[PDB]
């Protein structure tokens, strides 16, 4: 009974590292990523920050648990697993890779990787 695209990306973990000349982040230890109804979970994430663009940075997650879950009020859960995941800021691209699996009311697929957009 709340929005998911309505809410900011919440992130937490126990290691955090940045470099302004390396232009890159590290987080480490059970990284939890959430927005409203969406739950996404890894052990590490990577993001390159060029700067000069604004909002073209991408959030590449890896290491177990490497799981996705969502619950809609509209009787529509969806959940899945992989080894590696690409997540992003608005629509830009999405893919799950390494033993990827996904299930929903009108949708059932599994393999090395799943093709599905935002």
């Amino acid at each position: 009974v709340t929005g998911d695209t309505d809410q900011p990306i919440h992130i937490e973990s126990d290691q955090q590292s940045l470099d302004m000349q390396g232009n890159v982040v590290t987080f480490t230890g059970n990284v939890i990523v959430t927005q409203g109804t969406i739950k996404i979970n890894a052990d590490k994430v990577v993001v390159t920050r060029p700067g000069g663009e604004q909002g073209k940075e991408v959030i590449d997650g890896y290491g177990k648990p490497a799981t996705f879950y969502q619950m809609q009020d509209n009787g529509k859960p969806v959940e899945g697993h992989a080894s590696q995941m690409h997540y992003e800021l608005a629509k830009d691209f999405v893919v799950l890779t390494g033993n990827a699996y996904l299930q929903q009311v009108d949708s059932n697929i599994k393999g090395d990787k799943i093709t599905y957009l935002v």
Binding site: P8, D14, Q16, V47
Partner: peptide, 16 residues
């Protein structure tokens, strides 16, 4: 949607 995190190892948060 904005990127925001909380640091377990100090007590406080950031955007990046």
């Amino acid at each position: 949607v904005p990127i925001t995190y909380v640091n377990r190892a100090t007590x406080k948060c950031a955007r990046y």
